[PDB]
Curated annotation (Swiss-Prot), chain A:
Glycosylated. Hemagglutination activity is not dependent on divalent cations. Hemagglutination activity is highly inhibited by D-galactose and N-acetyl-D-galactosamine, and to a lesser extent by raffinose. Also inhibited by melibiose and alpha-lactose, but not by beta-lactose or D-glucose. CDD domains: beta-trefoil_Ricin_MytiLec-like. Optimum hemagglutination activity at pH 7.4. Retains its hemagglutination activity throughout pH range 3-10. This protein is most stable at pH 7.4. D-galactose 3 binds at residues 76, 109, 112, 128-130. It comes from Mytilus californianus (California mussel). Coiled coil: none annotated. One of its GO terms (molecular function) is galactose binding. Optimum hemagglutination activity between 37 and 40 degrees Celsius. Retains its hemagglutination activity up to 60 degrees Celsius, but loses the activity at higher temperatures. This protein is stable at high temperatures over 80 degrees Celsius. The thermal stability is increased by the presence of ligand D-galactose. Keywords: Glycoprotein, Hemagglutinin, Lectin. This is Galactose-binding lectin.
From Swiss-Prot, chain B:
Keywords: Glycoprotein, Hemagglutinin, Lectin. Optimum hemagglutination activity between 37 and 40 degrees Celsius. Retains its hemagglutination activity up to 60 degrees Celsius, but loses the activity at higher temperatures. This protein is stable at high temperatures over 80 degrees Celsius. The thermal stability is increased by the presence of ligand D-galactose. It comes from Mytilus californianus. Signal peptide: none annotated. Homodimer. Likely to form large oligomers; oligomerization enhances hemagglutination activity. The keyword Iron-sulfur does not apply. D-galactose 1 binds at residues 16, 19, 35-37, 119. GO terms for molecular function: galactose binding. Glycans are attached at residues 26, 74, 118. This is Galactose-binding lectin. Hemagglutination activity is not dependent on divalent cations. Hemagglutination activity is highly inhibited by D-galactose and N-acetyl-D-galactosamine, and to a lesser extent by raffinose. Also inhibited by melibiose and alpha-lactose, but not by beta-lactose or D-glucose.
Amino acid sequence: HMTTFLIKHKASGKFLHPKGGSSNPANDTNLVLHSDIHERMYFQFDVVDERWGYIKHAASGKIVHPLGGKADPPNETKLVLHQDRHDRALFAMDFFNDNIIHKAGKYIHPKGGSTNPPNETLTVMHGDKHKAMEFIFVSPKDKDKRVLVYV
Amino acid sequence: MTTFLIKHKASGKFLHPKGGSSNPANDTNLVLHSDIHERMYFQFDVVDERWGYIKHAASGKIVHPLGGKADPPNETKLVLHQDRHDRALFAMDFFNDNIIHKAGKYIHPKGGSTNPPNETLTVMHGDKHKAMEFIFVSPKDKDKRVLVYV
Ligand SMILES: OC[C@H]1O[C@H](O)[C@H](O)[C@@H](O)[C@H]1O
Ligand SMILES: OC[C@H]1O[C@H](O)[C@H](O)[C@@H](O)[C@H]1O
Ligand SMILES: OC[C@H]1O[C@H](O)[C@H](O)[C@@H](O)[C@H]1O
Ligand SMILES: OC[C@H]1O[C@H](O)[C@H](O)[C@@H](O)[C@H]1O
Ligand SMILES: OC[C@H]1O[C@H](O)[C@H](O)[C@@H](O)[C@H]1O
Ligand SMILES: OC[C@H]1O[C@H](O)[C@H](O)[C@@H](O)[C@H]1O
Ligand SMILES: [Mg+2]
């Protein structure tokens, strides 16, 4: 069993989407911020090892990858969806500090770091911590109710 | 139903029911002790998102602030008790490595030592520091962290 949830950008109220909102995004489709809510921006978290797991797009089964699948992606590495499952797509959903951390230690950011980015803004990896990289994980039926993604 | 050990990060001691009984009486103190055995295994029963009950596996008793108050003061002793209610809600913060009560204070060793001796009591205190950090590990591998939210 896996709780279905929305990944909500705390500062803007926007959500993580595959660019274009497809039920089956092509491999390497970018992960962007968008204000819309619908079935094709639902996500699930597939726990792999304690805190580490795959951030899975619910509609397609593709998971979030740093583009290129490198072990230690540099700052500004774009985030995309890809079907492959391996250790470089491992993230942890820190619901206490409200962020999404990659196994190599960087966080998911809006590209450019705005607290209030436009729709379709890309998301990237970056080592910095500030309030524009905060995310909470909420019920698809109530965007203000936090849900436990680890069950 | 994952079973885990609650390991005091700085010393490597573990939370025990005082006395090591598989059947601790109500209001038995939670203490730190170096020994490992099934009578110090814990479970976590999720109630509401991050909040749940910290449960002594062998007895089913859960962790309470002594007195069951909703907003216990600093130095309130932590004990085991069978009752289930909202004043016994905790979250297991495995990212910052601490155990936080619903009202915002944390589980500490009494006195705040990074190396508390065996039988040191545990208490609630609002401060954050190295000596109140806990990690949650596998009974078959005291260095492998396990997910308690299950
Ligand atoms: O790029 C993301 C964006 O794509 C499409 O335009 C959809 O219609 C939107 O709802 C959103 O999912
Ligand atoms: O872009 C991400 C994607 O592409 C890489 O080159 C890898 O081969 C895949 O496993 C996946 O990580
Ligand atoms: O692209 C993401 C990046 O954008 C800006 O440069 C910010 O200052 C960084 O902290 C980070 O958020
Ligand atoms: O108080 C804790 C302590 O209690 C008893 O002495 C047990 O033998 C120990 O292993 C430990 O559980
Ligand atoms: O020691 C804790 C204990 O405190 C009170 O007496 C309550 O009535 C119990 O439910 C329990 O919480
Ligand atoms: O007993 C608990 C308490 O002990 C000391 O006062 C420490 O300074 C506090 O930070 C706390 O750990
Ligand atoms: Mg119960």
